[PDB]
Design a protein around this ligand. Structure first.
Ligand SMILES: *[C@@H]1O[C@H](CO)[C@@H](O[C@@H]2O[C@H](CO)[C@@H](O[C@H]3O[C@H](CO)[C@@H](O)[C@H](O)[C@@H]3O)[C@H](O)[C@H]2NC(C)=O)[C@H](O)[C@H]1NC(C)=O
Ligand SMILES: *[C@@H]1O[C@H](CO)[C@@H](O)[C@H](O)[C@H]1NC(C)=O
Lengths: 99, 49, 50, 50
């Protein structure tokens, strides 16, 4: 941990990055974008948050991007904007041939 | 209901409804919290049924 | 993105326990309003669907 | 003069307090109102006689 926490410059490509680029263009704000070592969207670990919620609560990162749901537990410590895509618990089926 | 009128077209303008209310009135956060709670526990499913 | 699209979804989006994916902001920052209006604008303009 | 009518027209005047109705979230309305978290997701479609 004494040496530099690895700053591997990678390139990012996805839907949420495009959302971020569009909102940045519309609002004219730049961003130091980085990824968290937790690897989770965030759950209450003994009253402590991690990942997106952990970084936002401790304010090391101002905002969190990605596929983040909106639930009442998360809204306790952070606030969510109007959701842009619709998700939830859904059913996946195999196709059936004709009869 | 009627079964002689049929819907068509892929869902464009994918959005959501919402109860709109004045900016300065304070129920907003509590209203949103209650709506999310109703979504979580299936009360909205009971309404849909 | 199935290798043959041999499976299907449900109701074309008639979902149980419906929810949304969104952005996470600090507690009651001044940015929340601006990003809300920006996202609603991009919805209205129609870039999202494509 | 950019005047409003309808539910929002009577709300910005303060006659009412909360619109409980299938009101669609978008940018133009959100300027002069605020919207709770969406309680029913939906899209736009067409009817034709079968
Ligand atoms: C939104 O919901 C909130 C629920 O947490 C609510 O906060 C709670 O408000 C009650 C009463 O307003 C507080 O109870 C207090 O009751 C007496 C007299 O009011 C006090 O002497 C007590 O000490 C006690 O604090 C809750 O403490 C309070 N809880 C929290 C977490 O804030 C808001 O009032 C609601 N706001 C709106 C606009 O609906
Ligand atoms: C269903 O139809 C497809 C059409 O090519 C066929 O390949 C498949 O074998 C059929 N299912 C079964 C169980 O035979």
């Amino acid at each position: 941990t004494d040496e530099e926490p690895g700053y591997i410059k990678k390139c990012c490509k996805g839907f949420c990055i495009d959302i971020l680029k569009k909102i940045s263009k519309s609002v004219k704000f730049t961003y130091d974008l980085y990824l968290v070592t937790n690897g989770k969207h965030g759950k209450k670990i003994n009253g402590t948050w991690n990942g997106m919620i952990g970084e936002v609560v401790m304010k090391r990162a101002y905002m969190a991007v990605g596929s983040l749901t909106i639930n009442e537990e998360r809204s306790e410590v952070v606030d969510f904007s109007v959701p842009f895509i619709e998700t939830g618990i859904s059913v996946m089926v195999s196709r059936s041939n004709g009869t | 209901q009627k079964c002689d009128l049929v819907t068509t077209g892929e869902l464009f303008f994918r959005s959501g409804f919402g109860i709109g209310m004045r900016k300065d009135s304070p129920w907003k956060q509590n209203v949103s919290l209650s709506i999310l709670k109703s979504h979580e526990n299936g009360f909205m499913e009971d309404l849909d049924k | 993105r199935d290798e043959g699209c041999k499976l299907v979804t449900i109701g074309s989006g008639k979902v149980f326990a419906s929810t949304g994916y969104g952005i996470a902001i600090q507690k009651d920052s001044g940015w929340k309003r601006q990003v809300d209006l920006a996202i609603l604008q991009l919805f209205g303009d129609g870039e999202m669907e494509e | 003069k950019k005047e409003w009518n309808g539910m929002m027209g009577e709300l910005l005047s303060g006659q009412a307090d909360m619109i409980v109705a299938p009101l669609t979230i978008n940018n133009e309305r959100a300027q002069y109102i605020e919207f709770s978290k969406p309680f029913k997701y939906q899209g736009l479609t067409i009817l034709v006689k079968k």
